[PDB]
Design a protein around this nucleic acid. Sequence first.
RNA 1: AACGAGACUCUGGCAUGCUAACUAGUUACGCGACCCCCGAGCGGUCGGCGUCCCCCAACUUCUUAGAGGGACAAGUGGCGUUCAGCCACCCGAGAUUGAGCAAUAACAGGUCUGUGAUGCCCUUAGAUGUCGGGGCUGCACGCGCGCUACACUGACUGGCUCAGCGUGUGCCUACCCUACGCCGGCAGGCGCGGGUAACCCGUUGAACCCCAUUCGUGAUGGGGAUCGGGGAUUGCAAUUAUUCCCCAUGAACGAGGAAUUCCCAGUAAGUGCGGGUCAUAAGCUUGCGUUGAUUAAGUCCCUGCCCUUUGUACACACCGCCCG
Lengths: 68, 70, 46, 59, 75, 145, 141, 64, 191
Amino acid sequence: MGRVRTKTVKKAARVIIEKYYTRLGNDFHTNKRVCEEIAIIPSKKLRNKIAGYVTHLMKRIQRGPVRG
Amino acid sequence: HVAQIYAIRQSISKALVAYYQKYVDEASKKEIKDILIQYDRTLLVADPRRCESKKFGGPGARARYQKSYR
Amino acid sequence: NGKTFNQVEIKPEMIGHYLGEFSITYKPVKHGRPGIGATHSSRFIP
Amino acid sequence: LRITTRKTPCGEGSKTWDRFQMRIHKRLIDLHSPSEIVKQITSISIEPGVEVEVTIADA
Amino acid sequence: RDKLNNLVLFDKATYDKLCKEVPNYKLITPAVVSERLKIRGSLARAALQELLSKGLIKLVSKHRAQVIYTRNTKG
Amino acid sequence: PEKFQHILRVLNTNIDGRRKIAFAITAIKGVGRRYAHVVLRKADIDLTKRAGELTEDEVERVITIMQNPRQYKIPDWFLNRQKDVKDGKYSQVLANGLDNKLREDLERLKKIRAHRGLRHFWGLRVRGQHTKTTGRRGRTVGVSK
Amino acid sequence: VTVKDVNQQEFVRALAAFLKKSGKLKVPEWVDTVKLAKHKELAPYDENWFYTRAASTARHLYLRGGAGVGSMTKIYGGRQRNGVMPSHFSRGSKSVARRVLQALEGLKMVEKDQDWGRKLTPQGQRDLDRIAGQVAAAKKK
Amino acid sequence: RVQPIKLARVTKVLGRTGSQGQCTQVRVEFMDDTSRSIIRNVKGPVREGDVLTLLESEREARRL
Amino acid sequence: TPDIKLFGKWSTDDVQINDISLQDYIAVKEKYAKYLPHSAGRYAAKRFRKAQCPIVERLTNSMMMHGRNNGKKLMTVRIVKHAFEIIHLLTGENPLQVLVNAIINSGPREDSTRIGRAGTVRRQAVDVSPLRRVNQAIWLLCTGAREAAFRNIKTIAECLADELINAAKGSSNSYAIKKKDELERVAKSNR
RNA sequence: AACGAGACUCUGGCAUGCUAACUAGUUACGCGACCCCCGAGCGGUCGGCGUCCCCCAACUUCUUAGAGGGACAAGUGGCGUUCAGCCACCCGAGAUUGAGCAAUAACAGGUCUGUGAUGCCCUUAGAUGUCGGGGCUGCACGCGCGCUACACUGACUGGCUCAGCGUGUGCCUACCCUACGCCGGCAGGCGCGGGUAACCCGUUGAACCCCAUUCGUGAUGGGGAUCGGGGAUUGCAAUUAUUCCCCAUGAACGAGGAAUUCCCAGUAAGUGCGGGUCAUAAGCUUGCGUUGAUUAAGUCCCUGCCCUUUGUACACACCGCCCG
């Protein structure tokens, strides 16, 4: 188990949601392909992570305001 | 001798299925799928397990040579 | 041998063998009186 | 190519080794055409250090 | 180790009992003949082969390393 | 059946009628199991029965087929001894003669006094072997005061 | 039938008997002094081992593309217990297999064909499949 | 003792005890009385909802 | 029968578990009856995963032990086919009901363990899981047949079928029902 | 803000999607040939068995290796501040298949016998620089790493049937891997041929395992130590037995004290094979396949390690310091 997300993910995840808020869905696959086009993530496994956290944030942003 | 037996079983199970998947309708083979997968024993699936690579200081991949302090 | 010329008479009963079987090149061995570290006990002095 | 040898000169300390490997690659393209234009165009237009061996016939 | 007595060929009482122990015993293996009588055990192997040709015993299973024989398959 | 006889005496060693024929014979020195399954077949008799079931007529033939093996066409290489040394022939040696022959070759190698007889007389290993960690009879050693 | 259909433990035990009836196989003199391989510690119990092994010889030639005296030995070889040393594989005898294959060839059930190996004669192939059905006739396949 | 063989079942697992974690505290329901409950120490790996075979319920657990 | 495998000849119907305690860790017939005891090699990667696989297979696994017999699971199945055969001729039952009694009669009711006080040995009585009982009972009786055939003319098949009889009907001529009662005799003392 | 952790690289696991193959296969016939009626029929044909024939046939599932895709705690139910996360389940390959790389500071750790790396000292013609011989193997003893065994879950003799990682002459200076034919019980000898290697050895026709005889609880046919005689191979030379083979000889040992090592899934254990050293020769080491369990899903009790708090006459740091 383990697999607690690092800061490199959480730093860019916030940034990518702020400046491309409109492009986001709430599906994994759509939010992946957007991150692939609006930026380059130099790995493939890293890309699959940053999408999933961008998805997980976008769930909460449709409720009350996030403090990050 | 052993692993071959599981291979020939796994193939003939899937072979039969494919014949129905291609020339007969869905509801014929869906039935057959429920029967086999009930007592699944790697008939329609495959183990991902193969041997691990040895590293030095052991005769096996985990087992190690004896250690003496005197 | 290593230093010494051990002389031998040649018999008709020695035929087939080599020369070097009739001259040895070591002292047979004696002992001994085990020494100090000759075991898991030898140690200490100060 | 595998080479499995000591990591320690003058062996002492915990016994360790080191796997080195080199991977070669082969692949070949078969043409059938006049030998002139082949030997003309082949030897040119190669930037990297990569070898080429032309054969008269094999089939 | 120990010393146990054995006989490599039959005498009167062993042989005569051998014919009458059969209906009294449901299980028959060469091993069981080793204990109930004093018999080598290899003697008991071939002794049972003889009986099956008469039909006084019945085969029920056979293998390289172990063999089973029964009374008459009656009940 | 076959209650006729059991344990018997043959040349130089007592052989039981308890055991199978080939394996029974092996107790006699100079005869191994490999040497006996040949000699029985040259004699053209069963090896599928006990040694107590042989008759006197049969065993009389056994020792003849044994002690003249070349004349019953058992090959020379299959013998114990090929050109003994200083006797000039192929030979087959059996129980009490084996020991007598053996003791001669020991005596011979101290006569010439090669490396061999010295190692024999000292009670040390003849062949190339380490004796540093091999042996013990002995081990009680002390050094303290 | 093809020889594939039947059991093979049964195949040899009727094929060995077949040959010995018909006066077939001129045997070597050495057959009662022969260890039979380097990795054995004893002679065979069997007194008709030559007949048995010629059966197994001709069968393998039916399956595979045929090969010489070397390959037959490699098929038969097994494990060698070297005593205190660890066991290893080794090959058995050669000069026995060299008598087997030449004895078969005298009957013209095999013959030295092209591509580095003896191959079994059509007369041989006839005789195999002939007794192959005799196995099924006997017990009941 | 002279009590007959009782049967009682797990309601919940509490935590592991002993000096190598080899004992397990557990709460068990008496399986004849549904308001009765005793705490026990049980050796083997247990899940929840499985039944035990108590020889007495006089005994009760309190510590490792 | 045409929708549920036997054992190659032995019914898994008319087979009961006669405790309410030890069922759901003894099962053999819910759909878990198969022609042979074997697996693809999934048996454990979770704690609960152990339970599911048959009792007859578990018996075959714990039969091959002590060096020379490890990794010879096919040789092991030879001994089991003779076992049921000998059990059926010898007493005459559905020979699985023999085994189920033999397992249930050999599992302990109470057990002891260690506890550290004053740097001296003290012991404490504790209870035992149903899963523990099954694991223990399979261990104990397999040790019996292994022990007996270590110098006896009798084969391990014969020894093992004898050991399931004396367990299935308690009589204290088995290695199991002896050793069971030893543990409980201790558990009474220190409690 | 930086280094380490992670990220990364390699490897395993998922593709009937993509790319393309007589130094890789399959299928399809064209087939003609062999084989047995073995099944319907008659033997033909239809069906079955492999091989030759195969193409200007068709294809790339299998094999090969490239480009890509796929797994993210993604979805659902619990739990958590409802945050960071954790547990169960669906789909399925579950968020851990195994390795490589790895910080700051330190050690009077190992290595001057790897180095034409190197200081200083020594020696340098009666040489510490070359040929011949001997030794590193010498045993009343002590210890360590391992190998083979103590049998019937076995040994023995026949019969059946399955694999993978590699490697190979044309190199060092004289040397490779071997098919096939012939001769020999065997070791081996001899005659021919191929291989720069997905091309020849090798469709690597391996062991355990599997099937059938024999032995019978006996230090036995279990065990193969010791030891005699004989035959071959390598080399310039084989004695203190280089190695290999044949016959004979037949010991300890019948499950092991005080103690102690190692291991959690294709893992332990059993079992064989390739590479390394190599003129001749692995009980060693390094990799690889094959057969394949029991037990745990925890804890700080022992041994040890990380973080905080506390006490200290310690800092050569408790293997410390110090009293009569």
